[PDB]
Design a protein around this ligand. Structure first.
Ligand SMILES: *[C@@H]1O[C@H](CO)[C@@H](O)[C@H](O)[C@H]1NC(C)=O
Lengths: 31, 49
């Protein structure tokens, strides 16, 4: 999830259908 | 002991993304439309209520 590269180079990562307590291979929890 | 068959699709890579609007948001839209229709007839579709 990113804005345009003309704006910034900062991104966010969404792991689909993954509980955060088991995320590894801020932190918010969504549906 | 029994696979629910959603797990087979998930293990083979067939997933389902959630909808953007929740059922609470859909119910809020229907409540807003219903309350506007009851209170103001048809004028809220044109201008203000
Ligand atoms: C992750 O799974 C555990 C399993 O018991 C659950 O208790 C926990 O609430 C889950 N995490 C979130 C953020 O719901």
């Amino acid at each position: 999830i990113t804005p345009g590269t003309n704006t910034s180079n900062q991104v966010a990562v969404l792991y689909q259908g993954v509980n955060c307590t088991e995320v590894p291979v801020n932190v918010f929890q969504t549906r | 002991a029994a696979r629910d068959l959603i797990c087979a699709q998930k293990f083979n890579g067939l997933t389902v993304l959630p909808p953007l609007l929740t059922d609470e948001m859909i119910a809020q839209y229907t409540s807003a439309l219903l309350a506007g229709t009851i209170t103001s007839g048809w004028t809220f579709g044109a201008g203000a209520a």
